[PDB]
Every structure is written in C-alpha cells, then in structure tokens.
Ligand binder design. Structure first.
Ligand SMILES: *[C@@H]1O[C@H](CO)[C@@H](O)[C@H](O)[C@H]1NC(C)=O
Ligand SMILES: *[C@@H]1O[C@H](CO)[C@@H](O)[C@H](O)[C@H]1NC(C)=O
Ligand SMILES: *[C@@H]1O[C@H](CO)[C@@H](O)[C@H](O)[C@H]1NC(C)=O
Ligand SMILES: *[C@@H]1O[C@H](CO)[C@@H](O)[C@H](O)[C@H]1NC(C)=O
Ligand SMILES: *[C@@H]1O[C@H](CO)[C@@H](O)[C@H](O)[C@H]1NC(C)=O
Ligand SMILES: [Ca+2]
Ligand SMILES: [Ca+2]
Ligand SMILES: [Ca+2]
Ligand SMILES: [Ca+2]
Lengths: 478, 323, 388, 98
C-alpha cells in the first residue's frame, strides 16, 4: 500500500451512485472541458475538485498552460499566427480578427493554389483567366490573365505568358522581361521592383504581383475584396471548399473540367481528363527511377526545413515535386526540380523562417557575372538565402508598399554611403542618383507623372526628368 | 568486432546476433534483419513448412532477389544466371558456397551446400535493427522486442510477430511441432548423448569456453538427436555451428572435423577446408596480389594444385583459353 | 462535367437543385446533412468533407453537441495488426443526456450494450431506435436528427441534419461547410499538424500521443508493394467509370494502399476499401456492379441470394406484424431472398404461411388462438387479428 | 539538341582541332541512361571533359553560364565572413602554382 501525497485525497466508490467518476475520469488540463466515461472509480488518490493533474504534479490553480504545437504556453503568453496575435487569457486561445493577405501561386508548371488554400492539378495549353474582378455583379477593374504553351506535360518547354489588364492598360510579361503594350492612366500606383530573383510588381493599393522570372505567379490581394473576385484562384471568401465555382456558376468536383470553364478562347482545345495514377508518364512502370525521385523530393522533409515543417505542411509541395520532375526530363538546366523547393522555401520565409538549403552540389545559383562588367571584381553581388526585396535605389529612393518581406537571389551588398542603381550595376554614392526635389518637398526621383489635375486655377505643375529644378506652365482651357 | 552474425543452422534452429538460440518451424517469409526506424533494405527467409527454402533481399521498394536451397536465383520473377552484380549487390560464390554481398548497404549474406543462412552485418546498426535475428545490442536476452516492441519471454510467438505476407500467399501462425521423440525414447538418449557431449570433452573444442559457452549448444542438440533414426551424424549440425561461432569471435579452431566423423557437404573435387582465403587463385585469373587482404573464411576448396575452372577443380596444366 | 444540357433543365445534386438559364446554372445554397466517417484502419472524414488519418490509440472524442449537450460520441481506437501503422476501431460509446443520461456502447460484433446490459434489436425506446439493417449491421436512430452505422469491424458513420449547423466540436470538425478550419483544437485555434490535432481530443492522460503519422506502411512490408498497386488499380479502372464524376476517387485510392500493406490479411482490407468508394458513389446516386468471384463477392447463405439494389421493407416477418408502419428506406444492397419468401429469425427465410406474429413483441406461432374474456385474438399468417 | 553545345559558336575554335563526334556520342549515351533529377552532372561533366581537352591544345573556353551548369564559388569567400572575396573560379587557371 501507499498513503498518497498530502495535496490530494483518496476516494472510494459508493455502493449507490453509479456515477462513481473517480480515478478513471482523472481530469488533466486536456480533458477538463472534455466529457468522460466511467463505469466505477478505483482505489486511487485523486486531486481535490479545485485542481487537476499536470505532468506528475497536481497543479493547484486553473492556470495550467495553453498548448499549441504540443508546446507549453503560460497564461498571458502570446503567439503570432499570420498577421494576428493571440493570447491565452484563461485556458483557450484568444485571437484577434485581422484577416491577412492571401496569395495565389503556380507551384511548378501545372498546379494552382487558391487564396483560401486549395492545391489542384490542371494541365492546360490555352490561355486562362487566373483571377479577375469582373465577376457577376461588379465593375470589373482588373483582369489578370495567364497563358501557357506546350505545358500539358511539364518539361523544359512551357514558357508562360501573362497579360494583366488594370486601369485600361496592357502591361504583360514573358521571356525574362516585362512589356507595356498599353500604359494605364494612373501611373502613380504603378511600380516595378526588380530585386533579387523576382519581379515584384504593384498595381494599386490592394494588388501586387510577384514573378520568379521562370514560371511562378504569386499575386497578393489585401483585405479589400473579400469575395469580389473569381477565376482559377477561387473567390477569396475564407470558405475553402467553394473555390471550384465554375464560370457557369456551379461547384464542380473535378478540376480538369473547372479550368476548362475559365479559358479565354472558347474554341481552342480543352484539356483531357487524364486517368488517375500515382506515377506520371516517366515514372509510370519505372519503379527504379520512381524511388530515386522520391528520395530527392525528401529534401522537403530534411534537417534544414524542420523549423518550417512544423508551420507549413510540406505534403502539398511534395506532391508537386514528384509530379513535375517525373514528367520533366531535366537534361540540361534542372530547374523543374530546383524551383519546386524554392517555392516552399519562400513560403517558409513569409512566416519568418529564412532557410539556407542551397549548396554547390544542388541547384548552385552563382552570382559572379554581375561582378564582371568592371575589369576589377568589386564583388558586391552576393547570392543570399532571403534578402529583403523592398529597399531604396536611385530609381526608387522612397520606401514602397512591401507585400513580400524578403526574397532569394543575387543581392548587391556593399558598404554604406552608397545606394544601388541597376543601370550602372554597382552601388554608387547617393548624389549620383538622378534625384529630384522641386520646391522643397521629398518625393521620388523625378517620376514621369503630370501632378495636380484637379484644380485649374492651382495648376502649378513641376515635373523633373532627372535633376532639373524646373516647373512647366499649364495650358489654359479658355 | 565491428560486425554481427546470425545463423539459421540445421533444421528450425536460429542464432541471433547476441548468443540467443531457439527453434522455430515457420510456414512463410519472416524478416531476418533490417532497419526498424527506416529500412534501406530487408532480409527475409521463406520457410516451406518449417524447413527453409529461400533467402531474399528486398532493397527498399524497387529490387528483389530470391536465392534458394537448390542454388538457383531469380530477380523479381525472371530467373537470372549467376554471378550477378546489379544494383550494387554482388551475387557470387565463395569456397563452393553461395554469397550475397551488400557492402554498400553494410551486410554479407551467404548459404552453404546443406542450407544454413548466415548474415554478417555491420556495426552501423547497433540497438538499431530488429527482426528475427534480434537486435545488434549487447543484451543476449532482451533481443525479443516484437514488431510493436515488447520483451516477450517466448522464442516462438516472437518469430511469428515478424511475419510478412504477399499477394501470392497470405500466411498464418504456424504451430510448434508435436514431438514424436517423447514416446520413442529408448536407447536413443543413452548411446548418443556423447556426440553432444564432445563439444565439452574434446580438447579441440576445450578452449573456446572463455569466449563462448557450449551450454546452449549442447542444450539445443539433445532435443534434435531423437527424431532421426540411427545416426551419430545428427549431432554435427548443432556442432558445426559452434565451430563458426567461436571463429567469428576472433579465435578460430583447427582440424576439429578430422575425428568428428562429419564433414559439411560440398560438390565433387572439393571438400571442407578451414580458413581458406576468399581469393581462390583460379585458372583464368590475372596474377596480381596484395589486394586481397580480406579476412579468412571457412569453406571447401580445391586441392593444392587443381585450379578452379567453372565450378570444378581441374589440374593447372589444362587451363584452357577463351575467345 | 464535360457534357451538355439543354436550357431549362434542372439537374440535382444530392444537396439541392440547379437549373440552366442563359448558360449559367442557378442554384440554391440551402444546407444539407453532413457525415463524419470512420473506416479502414484510421482514415477519417470530417463533416466538411475533409480526409485525413491519425493513428492514435486512445478514447478520443469523435463528435459532440457543443453549444448544448444533446449528445456526445467517443471513439475507442486500437492497434489492429502486427504493424504499428494499423490502428482500427474497436468500439464507440454514445451518450444521451436527453434520456436517463444513459450510456450506449456499440460493440465489435453487431452487439450493443446499454449501461452494461446487452440488448435485443429492435430497441424502441422513446427517441432512439436501434435495429439491424441487413441483419449484419446495426443502425441507431435518435429522434430524426441523428443516425449511426455498424462499429463492428470499424466502419462508423453518422448523419447530422442541418439543425446542428456549426455547433459541434470534436475530431470531425465544426459542420460549418468550411473544410479548412477543421484542425481546430479544443483551446480554439487551428493546428497545421494532424499529430497535434487528434492527441488534443484524447480523454485519458496515460495514452501516449504519437509523433509521426507515417504515410507508407508498405515500406515495412515490401512484399505487399507490388500487390498493393494492382489491387486498387481497379479503383481507377472504368469499372468505377460512372462515379469518377460524382466523387474524387484519389483519396479512396490513397486509403487503400495504407490499409492493404498494414493489416494482417489484405484480402478483405482490400474489399472493404473498395466498398468504401462504392458506398460513397451510391450515396450520390451511382450504384456500381463491382463484385466478382475474384473481387470479393460475399456468400449469402442458401436461404438468401445476393442482390444489388432492393427494398429492405417487405423482407422481415416483423413487417407483416406491423404492416402499417412506414418504410421510407432506399434501394439497398445485400442478401435478400425471393419475394415469395420472407425472413425468419433462424437465418432461413420462409413463405408467409408459417411467418409468426410479433404482437406486443410476442412471437406467436403461425396458428395461435388467444384471448381474454373480453378481447379475442389470433395469429393467421404473420399478422395478429385481434377483436373485442 | 542539348548535346549540340559541343558544336556551338563558343567551341568553333576547338571543333577545328579536336573532333567533337567522339565526345558527342558519350553525351547522348550517358544522359539518356542517367535520369538527372537533382545535380545534373551526368550532362555537365561530359562537356567539361571536352572543354579541358580543348584547353590542352591552348584553346581556353568559357562555355559555362548561370542557366547551364552554374558552378558557384561563394561557399569559400562566403565562409570567409570578412568577404575579402578571392576564390574567383579563375576559368582554366595554371594548376601548378606555388
Ligand atoms: C478575449 O480577450 C478580450 C480582451 O481581453 C476579452 O474582452 C474577451 O472576453 C476575450 N474573449 C474570450 C473568448 O476569451
Ligand atoms: C543574407 O541575408 C540574410 C537575410 O537578409 C541576412 O540575415 C544575412 O546576414 C545575409 N548574409 C550575408 C552573408 O550577407
Ligand atoms: C528447384 O528449382 C526449380 C527450378 O528453378 C524451382 O522451380 C523449385 O522451386 C526449386 N525447388 C527448391 C526446393 O528449391
Ligand atoms: C537503445 O535504443 C533506444 C531507442 O533509440 C535508446 O532510447 C536507448 O538509449 C538505447 N540503449 C542503448 C543501451 O543503447
Ligand atoms: C583569371 O581569370 C580571368 C577571367 O577569366 C582571366 O582573364 C585570367 O587570365 C585568369 N588568370 C589566371 C592567372 O588564370
Ligand atoms: Ca472560396
Ligand atoms: Ca541482442
Ligand atoms: Ca469546420
Ligand atoms: Ca605557350
């Protein structure tokens, strides 16, 4: 026998009460709110009613922690999930209600992640409506489109084309660069930040685009819309299982039929319902190769990603890895594997988890060529895990609305007192920037915009091309 | 040390990595060894009905070999020839006995003529593997940690925990055999107690005692000297294991088979040597040396001359040419 | 779904209807009942049509009415083969605070036990009805807003009517239509790791929580890797062609390969999993004829015959005793016998001549003359003719 | 087409001296057989072999870009926290220095 400890007292099943909820229904902090079964009690020694067990210790108060990710949190401790803080006041988590900024994506060649979060497969070859605003009963401001070619099977083929239609403009991109086919009216919101490996591209207060130069399309929308869009990314409503509402206004179960509803040219070839299997064409009946590819995609579950695995599920991103590179042949530049990992690594970065997973024997990514045009290697362009994207330059001296915290790629690092300009590849002292300050106030480096449309009598315009402290005369309407 | 050793010697008898024997008359495949957290490979042993047939190595997910009693081998289902070296697994013969080496994966398997599975395994897997040959720890008793992980006193249900079935056949729990020895006792225990005894008495075995204990070996024989009718040879299988088990420890014995009146079976032209080099200088060989610094292995081999040429011992004069 | 319909047509989902007008289907948004499903080893379905797996062995809280406490369900889970990645259901406990604060237990047979007492089926108490369905599967029916399904070999199902919209909490989610929120711990925060979610709903502290939910048990049994492929390769075969456009097969395929490599005998583990998909196809409208002498055709006894889609209304001999009762049942699948024959208690089915009567429940032989002073009653043919 | 780098504008000098045809046959043979999932050296190496033979006949070549077999050298000068960056891939550099 053993006389139990002082802080608690032994119990006895009464012969009358069937509700002998004693030892069997030992209430810990987990199962307090949970309701328990019990046939009878036992000859145990249970805590008093005013307290519970806590890891071989009858913690007295009802202050015992608030678990998340199987980890302790004292009462008052906070946690940051997304753009929300969240404290556990008593015993449940007590969070804020600031809805965060969602993000489409094209992970690989033919996969699509919705705002609300829904990976689905859709190999297409026509042009498709990724996302727009002209949806049902709305004005229809922006009409982001996407168009792929030879991209039903992922390979070194499938160079994407993207045409984005906002403010009556036509700016588009492919083949490394962006092109303006029709400039839009309000140039003030226009902005391009070629920083590192990305093309960060704002278009307004509540719209931003990111492009890896290779395939990925990560548009970022703000809290503004909240179910004002539709397309291939769904509606951005929070509901996660209504992202397959086809253009004919009904949910479909099979995404291959869905995106067919969102093609632009209504007479091109719609894609084919593929028979479902775990092996793509190359990995089909190639079990040997199928294991080697499998192990290679297990970098997504590796010692270096252990931090991010706890936050972001790698399982969606793994499925794309195996799918693409089986289909892809990866003869020369083996980016049809390297990119899928980089996609996951950036999502890890967005949650504050910078990672260095890239070595010399795996997706090397040198940065020597920018440190070449000068005969003497100053050596300022260094590749870097995730260097911030939104810095100041001679072209963009002001800070910009920064949808992305940091980004991979080559990053020019040089001592201070020198600001980067892209035309002259190196960094240069600030005064060498063609910066503009007309009549005193601080603004950009002479943007090519005609300020002050509103009032005729106050039409006091002052442009600045590069350096000039000039002001132009307004043409009178009379 | 840096190595391990399992043995499935004679009929139904087992030797784990840590000095723990028993008997098991299985019915289907059973996992011999391999990882337990993760398996780069897996060694399995098929039993037809108690008696053994085939050793096999499933290398992860994509590759398999089935070498078996007779001596023939296949890959998947397609019967292949021998030798055979695919996927980093050299399938060779040594001293007239068949070998499967997985040095990249840190194991060496083999079989003799009589059929006796043996697994030499690298110390990389300590308190790491778990299968039918027990863990490569030190404890020579806890080495029954079931597929769940449960120290089970029984050497029988344990082995039945490590059963693996296929689509071609789904196997059940075998039963322990009902011994007919219990009624046909007679003289068979009196006159034949000695051939088990001589592991202890005879001087050639009287010196591995500080290294090993014959007490299990004499224990496991006395139950199997009773089913076979009219033979002293029934002791030499349990005995023949004891020779190697001492040899693996770093102390080899010599010429013990001379008076034991039992030699292990080998084909014509060869008989059982002890500690022959693996690099048998054959007929159609290049005369290079001091690369074969390997350890010394027992097995049957040719006479002093009589170079090997295609599985037989032929005189050195008649070495052919090839084109 | 890749096929045309003229305008004005009204195709109907299981949930509601939709009508073609100007190339645009118009649709209602009215709610419709959800289902949390347990099956296989450890393959779960949420109310909000989520799939996952959590091979935890403890008394976990499956579901519960959470704003009031009309009920509460508690799975009990067990390892279910030599493999560690084989955790199937043993039993489930149900608790009705509305009646006695009783405690029902569904047993790994077709058995049920109320408050420790074993009980014959049917079990008409006031609200809850517990009767067999095919005489091989139990069905609870509390009121009208609740159903259950056999937890014998562990294929538990539920039917929650839309009155419980969003007001439940457990392993099965909110029943709110939102599939994404479903890993919401009792402390009120969505967890991205399944290994965090299920262990937060155990009822006993001594139960070890797991650390990794393995995806490929086939690794620990490389023998079954070959077999596991062709075995549920038929799932995507055009044998099931008619309900690829009714429900996504791809998880049900995923749930196969976990089960066949895991359980002791992959024979029935296979053929239970295939029925898992057919049952869902049938629950949307599409029946499939997928049985063969190879592909696990069951063996109805000699008194019975196999049947694909039939009426479990005119089968039992009880029905002649209580003919007036409604049978608002579907076209079910199982072992029936021809219409001339009605089911007897002893596993045979018989014509209605010797089909006994169940007046007051009492099993009257086919010829039983029977009366107080004041009443006058007999059993003719399965019906009990009383008078006064 | 990918093995036709061995007959490209950058190798035109060496093509006149060394036959690329032997080296091409190896290119096509290896990388078909090779799967080239991760580090795609089963293609990059065959070219580097030809490029060195070109170097032995005095024909240095720069055929290696950022989108083809990149071969960074930061690690060193990176590990060199104080980035006195010196480990600059000196193309075909005299192997035998002091
Ligand atoms: C959450 O915290 C706020 C601010 O302290 C408090 O007003 C509110 O009652 C809390 N709600 C819950 C559900 O704990
Ligand atoms: C690389 O960038 C990261 C993120 O901005 C920064 O923390 C780190 O100091 C940088 N390292 C080098 C070597 O520049
Ligand atoms: C003997 O070899 C034959 C032919 O390869 C094979 O079919 C059979 O299974 C083998 N039997 C035994 C006992 O090994
Ligand atoms: C045996 O392995 C277990 C599990 O990895 C470990 O906890 C333990 O320390 C090991 N013991 C020995 C004696 O190596
Ligand atoms: C170093 O590389 C540069 C650029 O390729 C080249 O011009 C120079 O000759 C090289 N010098 C040596 C010593 O190899
Ligand atoms: Ca949505
Ligand atoms: Ca041991
Ligand atoms: Ca929910
Ligand atoms: Ca010279």
């Amino acid at each position: 026998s053993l006389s139990c400890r002082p802080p608690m007292v032994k119990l006895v099943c009464p012969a009358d009460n069937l509700r002998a909820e004693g030892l069997e229904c030992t209430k810990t902090c987990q199962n307090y709110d949970l309701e328990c079964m019990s046939m009878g009690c036992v000859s145990g020694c249970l805590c008093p009613p005013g307290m519970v067990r806590h890891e071989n210790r009858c913690v007295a108060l009802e202050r015992c922690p608030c678990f998340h990710q199987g980890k302790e949190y004292a009462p008052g401790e906070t946690v940051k999930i997304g753009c929300n803080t969240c404290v556990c006041q008593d015993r449940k988590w007590n969070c804020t209600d600031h809805v965060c900024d969602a993000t489409c994506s094209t992970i690989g060649m033919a996969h699509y992640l919705t705002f609300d979060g829904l990976k689905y497969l859709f190999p297409g070859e026509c042009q498709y409506v990724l996302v727009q605003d002209y949806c049902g009963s709305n004005p229809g401001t922006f009409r982001i489109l996407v168009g792929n070619k030879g991209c039903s099977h992922p390979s070194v083929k499938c160079k994407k084309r993207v045409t984005i239609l906002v403010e009556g403009g036509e700016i588009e991109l492919f083949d490394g660069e962006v092109n303006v086919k029709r400039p839009m009216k309000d140039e003030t919101h226009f902005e391009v930040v070629e920083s590192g490996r990305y093309i960060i591209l704002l278009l307004g207060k509540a719209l931003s685009v990111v492009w890896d130069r290779h395939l990925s399309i990560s548009v970022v929308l703000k809290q503004t819309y909240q179910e004002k869009v539709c397309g291939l990314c769904g509606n951005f409503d929070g509901i996660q299982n209504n992202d397959l509402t086809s253009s004919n206004l009904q949910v479909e179960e099979d995404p291959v039929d869905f995106g067919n509803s969102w093609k632009v040219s209504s007479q091109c070839a719609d894609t084919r319902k593929v028979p479902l299997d775990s092996s793509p064409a190359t990995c089909h009946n190639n079990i040997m190769k199928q294991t080697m590819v499998d192990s290679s995609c297990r970098i997504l579950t590796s010692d270096v990603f252990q931090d991010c695995n706890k936050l972001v599920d790698p399982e969606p991103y793994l499925d794309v890895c195996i799918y693409d590179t089986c289909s892809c042949e990866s003869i020369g530049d083996c980016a049809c594997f390297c990119d899928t990992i980089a996609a996951y690594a950036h999502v890890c970065a967005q949650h504050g988890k910078v990672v260095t997973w890239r070595t010399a024997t795996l997706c090397p990514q040198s940065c020597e060529e920018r440190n070449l045009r000068e005969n003497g290697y100053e050596c300022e362009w260094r590749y870097n895990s995730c260097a911030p994207a939104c810095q100041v330059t001679c072209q963009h001296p002001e800070p910009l609305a920064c949808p992305v915290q940091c980004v991979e790629g080559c990053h020019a690092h040089c001592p201070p007192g020198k600001i980067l300009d892209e035309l002259l590849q190196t960094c240069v002292d600030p005064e060498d920037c063609p910066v503009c300050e007309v009549a005193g106030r601080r603004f950009a480096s002479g943007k090519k915009v005609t300020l002050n449309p509103s009032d005729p009598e106050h039409c006091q315009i002052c442009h600045c091309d590069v350096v000039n402290l000039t002001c132009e005369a307004c043409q009178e309407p009379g | 040390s840096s190595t391990a050793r399992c043995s499935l010697f004679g009929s139904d008898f087992v030797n784990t990595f840590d000095g723990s024997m028993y008997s098991f008359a299985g019915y289907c495949s059973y996992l011999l060894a391999g990882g337990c957290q993760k398996r780069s490979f897996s060694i399995i042993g098929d039993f037809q009905n108690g008696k053994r047939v085939s050793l096999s190595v499933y290398l992860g997910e994509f590759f398999d070999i089935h070498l078996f009693v007779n001596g023939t081998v296949t890959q998947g289902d397609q019967r292949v020839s021998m030798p055979y070296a695919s996927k980093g697994l050299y399938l060779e013969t040594e001293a007239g006995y068949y070998k499967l080496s997985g040095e990249a994966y840190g194991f060496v398997a083999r079989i003799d003529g009589s059929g006796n599975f043996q697994v030499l395994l690298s110390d990389r897997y300590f308190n790491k593997t778990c299968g039918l040959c027990g863990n490569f720890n030190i404890f020579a008793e806890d080495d029954f940690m079931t597929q769940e992980g449960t120290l089970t006193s029984d050497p029988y249900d344990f082995a039945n925990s490590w059963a693996l079935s296929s689509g071609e056949q789904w196997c059940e729990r075998a039963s322990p055999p009902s011994s007919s020895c219990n009624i046909s006792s007679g003289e068979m225990q009196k006159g034949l107690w000695e051939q088990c005894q001589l592991l202890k008495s005879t001087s050639v075995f009287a010196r591995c005692h500080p290294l090993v204990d014959p007490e299990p070996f004499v224990a496991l024989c006395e139950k199997t000297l009773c089913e076979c009718a009219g033979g002293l040879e029934c002791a030499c299988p349990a005995l023949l294991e004891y020779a190697r088990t001492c040899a693996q420890e770093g102390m080899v014995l010599y010429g013990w088979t001379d008076h034991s009146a039992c030699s292990p079976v080998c084909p014509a032209g060869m008989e059982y040597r002890q500690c022959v080099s693996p690099c048998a200088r054959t007929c159609q060989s290049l005369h290079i040396n001091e690369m074969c610094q390997e350890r010394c292995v027992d097995g049957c081999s040719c006479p002093e001359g009589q170079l090997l040429d295609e599985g037989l011992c032929v005189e050195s004069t008649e070495c052919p040419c090839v084109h | 779904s890749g096929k045309r319909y003229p305008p004005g047509t009204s195709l109907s989902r299981d949930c509601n209807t939709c009508i073609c007008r100007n190339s645009q289907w118009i649709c209602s948004n009215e709610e419709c009942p959800g289902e949390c499903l347990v099956t296989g080893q450890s393959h779960f379905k949420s109310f909000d049509n989520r799939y996952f797996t959590f091979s935890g062995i403890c008394q976990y809280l499956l579901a519960r009415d959470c704003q009031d406490h009309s009920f509460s369900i508690v799975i009990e889970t067990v390892q279910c083969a030599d493999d560690r990645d084989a955790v199937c259901t043993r039993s489930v406990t149900v608790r009705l605070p509305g009646l006695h604060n009783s405690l029902v237990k569904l047993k790994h047979g077709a058995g049920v036990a109320m408050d420790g007492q074993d009980v014959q089926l049917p079990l008409l108490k006031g609200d809850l009805r517990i009767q067999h369905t095919v005489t091989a599967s139990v069905r609870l029916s509390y009121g009208e807003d609740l159903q259950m399904d056999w937890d014998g070999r562990g294929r538990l199902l539920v039917k929650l009517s839309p009155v419980y919209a969003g007001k439940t909490c457990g392993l099965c989610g909110n029943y709110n239509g939102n599939q994404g929120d479903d890993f919401l711990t009792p402390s009120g925060l969505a967890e991205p790791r399944v290994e965090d979610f299920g262990n937060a709903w155990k009822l006993h502290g001594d139960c070890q929580d797991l650390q990794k939910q393995h995806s490929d048990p086939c690794a620990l049994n490389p023998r079954m890797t070959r077999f596991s492929e062709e075995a549920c390769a038929v799932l995507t075969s055009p044998t099931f062609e008619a309900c690829h456009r009714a429900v996504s097969p791809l998880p049900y395929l995923r749930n196969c390969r976990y089960d066949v490599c895991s359980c002791s005998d992959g024979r029935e583990c296979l053929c239970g999993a295939l029925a898992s998909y057919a049952a869902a196809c049938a629950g949307r409208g599409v029946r499939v004829a997928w049985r063969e002498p190879g592909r696990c055709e069951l063996n109805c006894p000699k008194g019975q015959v196999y049947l694909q889609c039939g009426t479990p209304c005119n089968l039992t001999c009880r029905s002649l005793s209580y003919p007036d009762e409604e049978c608002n049942e579907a076209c079910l699948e199982g072992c029936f016998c021809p219409p001339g024959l009605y089911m007897d208690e002893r596993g045979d089915c018989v014509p209605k001549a010797q089909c006994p009567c169940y007046y007051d429940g009492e099993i009257f032989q086919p010829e039983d003359i029977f009366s107080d002073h004041h009443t006058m009653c007999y059993c003719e043919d399965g019906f009990m003719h009383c008078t006064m």
